Ligand binder design. Structure first.
Ligand SMILES: N[C@@H](CCC(=O)N[C@@H](CS)C(=O)NCC(=O)O)C(=O)O
Ligand SMILES: [Br-]
Ligand SMILES: [Br-]
Ligand SMILES: [Br-]
Length: 210
């Protein structure tokens, strides 16, 4: 095996995490290269597009292909690992949850980026407005497919991207998911029991601010 995966990103979960969880669940060993802010300006001018995540895949031929755009990388891997759905219906369910979670991710990232400062106002707005609306969609989606998995009865990218986005809600709007959307909180508790590689990884993962 000349085979090798190297993922490039800051010391942060953010856009890279769904790729880390997918490779973990697939049992694919990879070099998880997380560089510091001080290192970035001398790494940046060497990468295509000047942005991360980037996944460098050295295939069995020994040749290197460099892939951009976190959820394009995650979907291509997911398809390879049969985690993108087994029917068109499953594929649509995964896509529906990923679209809804992209919206939710933006809202919580905006809170995370808000000065200390002025955060509490943005949190209260979230709880009263786009929070309930997005979280109701996500809850209805997951309920429609049985509460444990977004699609089929096995872990998919839809589940993993739901999981990482619910982690962000739990950390940035503490208590809100647990009180207002108990089924989504139950999903967040349950999912790791559906891949023991996931659970061990989350146990040992470094703490980051997002
Ligand atoms: N939609 C892109 C977003 C990528 C992105 O936001 N990259 C930021 C990560 S903090 C970045 O590389 N910033 C460094 C810079 O632009 O110099 C994806 O999901 O890959
Ligand atoms: Br996570
Ligand atoms: Br995360
Ligand atoms: Br609450």
């Amino acid at each position: 095996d000349k085979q090798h995966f190297k993922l490039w990103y800051f010391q942060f979960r953010g856009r890279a995490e769904p790729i880390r969880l997918l490779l973990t669940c697939a049992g694919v060993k990879f070099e998880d290269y997380q560089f510091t802010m001080d290192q970035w300006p001398t790494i940046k001018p060497t990468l295509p597009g000047g942005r991360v995540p980037l996944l460098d895949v050295t295939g069995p031929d020994g040749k290197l292909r460099r892939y951009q755009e976190s959820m394009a990388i995650a979907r291509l891997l997911a398809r390879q690992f049969k985690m993108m759905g087994e029917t068109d219906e499953e594929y649509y369910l995964i896509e529906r949850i990923i679209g809804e979670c992209e919206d939710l991710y933006r809202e919580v990232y905006t809170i995370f980026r808000t000065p200390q400062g002025e955060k509490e106002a943005k949190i209260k707005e979230f709880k009263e407005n786009n929070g309930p609306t997005l979280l109701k969609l996500v809850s209805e989606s997951l309920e429609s497919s049985g509460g444990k998995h977004v699609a089929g009865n096995r872990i998919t990218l839809g589940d993993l991207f739901l999981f990482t986005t619910l982690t962000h809600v739990m950390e940035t709007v503490p208590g809100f998911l647990e009180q207002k959307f108990p089924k989504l909180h139950e999903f967040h508790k349950s999912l790791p029991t559906s891949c023991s590689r996931l659970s061990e990884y989350l146990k040992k993962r470094a703490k980051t601010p997002f």
